[PDB]
Symmetry: D2
Subunit: 286 residues, 4 copies
């Protein structure tokens, strides 16, 4: 009986869903953490049957969704909730959605878990290049995309079993430049990859828990489209990557499933590339 | 059905055996390519049942073939080795010949493990290594991967997968990892990228390398017991303090060889309890 | 006539001073940016002759200090000055010390400059390991140590000549784990090294200006001592680095001087290690 | 006074010449080691004054010596090359002999440049490279650095400095950089670390490598005009859009060889207008 918390699903078109689907093949029970502004729309669509085909694994298997909870990675505890958000129409009907509140809820309802997925990012100035990003904009990217991972580990470690495992998602813009990946998103991914190492040291030594990050190639997710640098990145990857196949969210999903299992017990602190090999190339091969 | 060729098993104390065990768990059929210096004894020990405890999960060894990755084709075999005591009776042990042999008996296969290394002057530091010694390390430990690819690629299906084993001394200095071995592993990790480009584009085949932590194998023990220090250091300082097992590398190998890793290629994946991530002893 | 702005000197015991000294050999005119809480003590010591021996370059040369200005890397513009700090006894007697204010002052007094040094870091929670660092603590480290570099470039680019050059200082904890380098300092250095690349792209393409970072080995600076992980790091480096010599601030200084000159015109976006080789080692060589 | 040996100049269109020019600016005395296939023509062109325009900053060429980094000692020279048309008249061109020669004429020196590479099968992709071709690339382009170190180290002062040149195809795939050249540069960058450990500890000598961007040298032009594409791509996409000059590498070389870089060792330093930092064309 394995339980995974996946923080960062808003629809069926991102990596978090692909990860949920692949874990389900292994009979892992899934809890979704859903950003409060899209929580109700998600629930409506789910209730309305919009995701029913998206949920099919096998001839014999539906995805087993244990729960779906509102989850906001910008707040650590109840003390951090600011009053404008406390009053926002979308947040008003929701409760216990800070990082600590959701660990407590999960623990109270289901007991201890053994897999944790961070699958989320935000950067209010993602559309500006780094040089024109404000302090507020930069720190928001770091806060939502990088620090949220450390906070998640801090609060969830207490409700996890020994030999538990943690993954996050990153992008290669942290290491090589991608013009257009703005707003301090590149900086936040670099911090996330570095933090994955430091966290692996503390979590390995103090709890025997492992943490890794998957550097994913491009996927036409809601976040990607909102940034169409994405249609370009996808076309580029499909022309130039060693592997010509379309990169699927379930390609990242099956890697995540492995990293989250005991089959990878001797892997920790690593950035694992799942991108059809594209990261290895220097120049276009024209 | 999955068929894997493992080049580089001589006993049950190395990474090749741990990889065999884990692949057998997943019901993949295993063919061993065994270096002629140890071929007769491995066979004998197996027949005489000494590996019975070691095969307990039981393993499905399809075939056990003499194999010497120094030789690309039968024409490369020098007269001396051809006439040598351990080679004289044996046939079809070159890279081209074992590939041809395997294809003839079993058809196309889908998994290839390179799990071997050799270097005449491993006990000399790099600065004191001869041209002959350095090139011997590159020939046996790096070029052997390229040639294995070249020949096995024609008897492998699309979507097949290749792994080798490497060591972090390619990237950070390990005094004692001598004879051009550090150089050979740096070349192997770089070649893993270039191969991944050619194999992916032309054959839809994947190739990755596992950077393993220390294990007290036959090879490791022979190198003038830095190995027991290496192990002790890893168990004291790695983020993860469990004993590193051969089957720990084996389960990551199984993953990389399987269709679960279809979007991973050209990568060096560290299976080392995280030791590689540390800068300074945390004393 | 070359002018360099060095932001981050508090005394003669850090890297900024070593950099100032080596630039002075090349007859570059130096402006110091000095954190306001230590500005007056610095000035007093300077006036009192405390640094006179520290200032000697040659038999023939004193260091040419063009000006010394209060400079606070936590504030971008006059609008950002918060009222508690506006009232702090040390800030009360000082003005025009935000990043934009000091670029304007330098420009007004001396015209355009051609070298810029970022030599500063802070992290209010540096003493906590990463897992126990708060959001506030983490974002403070990123704000003062990482974002300050982007802000400096944004405001100083307008007062720089073409073919100008920029360096910052980093540490290898960004890339490999150093227990004790807490507070999100590791994360901030990782962001700084990544940002150095992204900035090099924008600054190279839009202004023909270069930017690099020096990854320095350990030096017994005020900041290092305040963290004695430092006495240990220094002893370790001196036993285990390829090069056995004591690492001097002027060893980093002479590298900085080169990176800031036209002799390195084809180098940009790089992390250059100046650490006696220590970064290349895997295990102690006992 | 500073004395530098530059191994790998055959003309004025390569990195070796650009390095010579910049070192001469700093009044270092330059000795050239010139490969015998081009030795007579280089000498002739120099004597006949064709390099007069090229030497304008004027340069201080101390000596010009035939040198073949394939040979560690006189005993390594095969009878065929010893008797060959271009080698037959020449003496003292092995690594040990040029070191001995230099020491005898000039005493100890303080600077060494490795600026050479060679590979029989550079035009073949890696997968199609023979064992002989791959090992030839490693021998000439990587091992030559180790051996140069071994011998020059005894005729170098403490605090001396060594550089080689490398290319980013060691780290990221460049289709067309064939024949084991990518492998050779990965080995050279790794060996630069191991050497830095041994040389630093035992001799207080530094060693670093420069990863240069593209330059239309004789060597580059011979490889079946990817070079003109490489250059055009670099000038369109690098953060810095200036033409990359030979003397741009030369001024970084001068820095690394000088006491200004005394705390830098084991490093691969990119001098490439920043091209290496990019992931995707910014189109
Ligand atoms: N799509 C790609 O091409 C790609 C490539 C590499 C890495 N990634 C990474 O994968 C991860 C998932 O993104 P995706 O592309 O699947 O897009 P997505 O739009 O499916 O998921 C991003 C999720 O983050 C959530 N989120 C935003 N702010 C939040 C907050 N304050 N608190 C809690 N949740 C919040 C959003 O609701 C959204 O569901 C991200 O870390 C992203 O950086 C994506
Ligand atoms: N033991 C470790 O700690 C360790 C760590 C990292 C990497 N590795 C790597 O793992 C791989 C296996 O090493 P091991 O430690 O398990 O040693 P091992 O002694 O168990 O296996 C090496 C095998 O290579 C075979 N071999 C050598 N030359 C051959 C040739 N020319 N043709 C065919 N076979 C040949 C030998 O018979 C031997 O069985 C190597 O690539 C090694 O560098 C080992
Ligand atoms: N000392 C080392 O061992 C070492 C090693 C590697 C990197 N570094 C880096 O070198 C740089 C300089 O540090 P140092 O070791 O010379 O110490 P230092 O104490 O000499 O200098 C740090 C300076 O930063 C200033 N500062 C702090 N907060 C500021 C703010 N909000 N605004 C403006 N200035 C502020 C301080 O006044 C201080 O003068 C830092 O970036 C540090 O991370 C140091
Ligand atoms: N041209 C480029 O774009 C470029 C880019 C990156 C790196 N490099 C590297 O720079 C170095 C110099 O290359 P270049 O492009 O200036 O070419 P080049 O043709 O100017 O110089 C290479 C020299 O090596 C000499 N040489 C070859 N084999 C030798 C041997 N066995 N002994 C003695 N000398 C020998 C040749 O005579 C030749 O002068 C090489 O290490 C090369 O890989 C070149
Ligand atoms: O981290 C990502 C990385 C990519 C890679 C493709 C790409 C898109 C846009 C610009 C450059 C590259 C797509 C989507 C990603 O997720 C993001 C990006 C930005 C933001 Cl604000 C949020 C999220 Cl979830
Ligand atoms: O690549 C290896 C790496 C290690 C771990 C590190 C180590 C052990 C002993 C001395 C130095 C370093 C052990 C065995 C390894 O396999 C080798 C090494 C050298 C040789 Cl000649 C052959 C083999 Cl199979
Ligand atoms: O970035 C640095 C890096 C070191 C390396 C040596 C070291 C000291 C303490 C813990 C670990 C390593 C020393 C000082 C450094 O400067 C710092 C560190 C922390 C802070 Cl809050 C400020 C500054 Cl200027
Ligand atoms: O190492 C080099 C790197 C380049 C730049 C990249 C390049 C040029 C032409 C084809 C492919 C790649 C040019 C020349 C280089 O020197 C070489 C390459 C191969 C050989 Cl056999 C000899 C030399 Cl000197």
């Amino acid at each position: 009986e394995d339980i995974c918390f996946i923080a960062g699903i808003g629809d069926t078109n991102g990596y978090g869903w692909g990860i949920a689907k692949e874990l389900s093949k292994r009979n892992v029970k899934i809890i979704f953490g859903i950003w409060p502004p899209v929580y109700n729309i998600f629930m409506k669509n789910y209730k309305n049957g919009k995701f029913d085909n998206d949920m099919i694994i096998d001839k014999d298997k539906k995805m087993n969704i244990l729960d779906m909870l509102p989850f906001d990675a910008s707040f650590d505890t109840a003390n951090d909730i600011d009053e404008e958000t406390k009053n926002n129409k979308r947040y008003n009907m929701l409760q216990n959605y800070t990082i600590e509140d959701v660990a407590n809820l999960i623990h109270q309802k289901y007991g201890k878990i053994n897999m944790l997925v961070h699958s989320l990012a935000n950067a209010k100035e993602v559309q500006k290049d780094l040089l024109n990003t404000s302090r507020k904009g930069y720190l928001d990217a770091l806060s939502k995309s990088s620090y949220s991972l450390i906070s998640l580990c801090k609060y969830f470690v207490n409700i996890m079993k020994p030999q538990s495992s943690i993954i996050s998602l990153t992008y290669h813009a942290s290491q090589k430049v991608v013009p257009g990946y703005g707003g301090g998103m590149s900086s936040a991914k670099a911090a996330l990859e570095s933090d994955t190492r430091v966290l692996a040291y503390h979590l390995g030594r103090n709890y025997n828990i492992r943490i890794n990050t998957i550097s994913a190639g491009p996927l036409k997710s809601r976040a990607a489209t909102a940034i169409t640098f994405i249609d370009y990145a996808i076309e580029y990857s499909e022309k130039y990557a060693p592997l010509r196949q379309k990169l699927l969210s379930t390609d990242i999903g099956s890697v995540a499933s492995f990293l989250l299992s005991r089959e990878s017990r001797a892997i920790t602190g690593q950035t694992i590339y799942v991108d059809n090999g594209l990261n290895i190339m220097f120049l276009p091969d024209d």
